[PDB]
Amino acid sequence: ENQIAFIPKLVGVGFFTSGGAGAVKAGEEVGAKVTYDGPTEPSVSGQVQFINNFVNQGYNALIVSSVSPDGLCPALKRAMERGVLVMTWDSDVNPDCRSYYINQGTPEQLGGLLVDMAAEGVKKEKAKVAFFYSSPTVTDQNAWAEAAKAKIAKEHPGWEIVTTQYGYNDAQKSLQTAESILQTYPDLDAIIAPDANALPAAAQAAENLKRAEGVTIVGFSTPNVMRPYIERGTIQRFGLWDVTQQGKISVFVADHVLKNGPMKVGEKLEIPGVGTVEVSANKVQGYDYEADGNGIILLPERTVFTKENIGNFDF
């Protein structure tokens, strides 16, 4: 059977654990050997070492959520020149460095979701807002944050973005950053935290400092991590998408391409228990690059979690 590596930014974070579980399950469904493995720290070096290991083992495909737009390119290009299928999921690399990106949404959809969620709680024309996510280099979150900032400048001209700070996919660093944000900005109105670790850290610090009544806190994380904060009312809402299914889609697409050849832009793949996915042009993500057998496969939906529906999810 095909050997397929599914690599997160780092392990030990619910988002990535859940994605990997979907990938591993799909392997069993589709008849492929799927290995979920990755570094304990979100480093370029760590990801490159795992990439090199799977390539050296003669794996047929790898699907990675990248901590960097370009840092993985040499390793991934080495992979592709040896006939290894290279794909990304969650966070992309430069399009000439992979084939397909299994993508939860466009920067506009996701940036727009962040802003809309924040706007629901701010309900004030003049406001002070902080951005808080993993790192200034990571592909996905910076794309979304840039799109969100652009929307804020246009839709909410009275909002002042007072700071952008980073938690580095780390509970302790994120906790310190969140407490620092709150203490520096006593009149802060919102925190937009598009990162699985940053969001719960912001919620926690707000509870620690009794700041939750005044700061609207939104972002992207998993239900199992955010549950306590939603149930207590510390935050009202946050977003994500079906990351388990995202992992499944990645594996099915990989296995299809291995068995049947490259998909082209416009082409569709039927996936049992999922539906139909389609290859979009890189243009949908804002890239200026196209090539045969290269593109972006968008997830069907994003979800907003509140106390009303969080009980319906377990990941």
Residues that bind ligand PAV (CB under 6 A): 9, 15, 65, 90-91, 140-141, 194-196, 220
Do 66 and 9 contact (CB within 8 A), yes or no?
yes
Nearest approach, Cβ of 9 to ligand PAV (angstroms)?
5
Helices (H) and strands (E) in the chain, counts: 9, 14
The distance of closest approach from Cβ of residue 222 to ligand PAV in the complex, given in angstroms and rounded to an integer, is: 7
For the bound state, the minimum distance from the C-beta of residue 15 to ligand PAV, rounded and expressed in Å, comes to 4
Nearer to ligand PAV among residue 94 and residue 246 (C-beta)? 246
Sequential DSSP letters for 91-138: S---GGG-SEEEES--HHHHHHHHHHHHHHHH--SSEEEEEEES-SS-
Containing 223, the helix (H) or strand (E) segment is helix 223-232
Which residue's entry shows tokens 């290859």?
Answer: 279
Name the residue nearer to ligand PAV (CB basis): 30 or 110.
110
Amino acid at 271: I
Please enumerate in sequence order all residues whose Cβ is within 8 A of that of 260, keeping only pairs 6 or more positions apart, or say none. none
β 61-64/3-7 pair status: parallel
Nearer to ligand PAV, 133 or 257 (CB): 133
Q: Measured from the CB atom, is 61 or 145 closer to ligand PAV? A: 145
DSSP helix/strand/coil, 62:
strand
**Residue found under tokens 């919102």:** 190
Residue closer to ligand PAV, measured from CB, 40 or 56? 40
Q: Report the nearest approach of ligand PAV to the CB of residue 243 (Å).
A: 7
In whole angstroms, how close is the CB of 115 to ligand PAV at the nearest point? 15
Choice between 5 and 138, CB closer to ligand PAV: 138
Q: Nearest CA to 105 among 289, 280, 290, 305?
A: 280
The two most distant CA atoms of the chain are separated, in Å, by 58
For ligand PAV, the closer CB: 2 or 18: 18
Q: Which is nearer to ligand PAV, 107 or 295 (CB)?
A: 107
Task: State the nearest-atom distance from the C-beta of 19 to ligand PAV, in Å.
Answer: 9
Residue 149 phi, psi (nearest 5): -65, -35
Nearest to 73, CA basis, from 57, 95, 104: 95
- Minimum Å gap between C-beta 163 and ligand PAV is 19
Q: Which two tokens stand for residue 297?
A: 């496969």
Q: At its nearest, how many Å lie between ligand PAV and the CB of residue 264?
A: 27
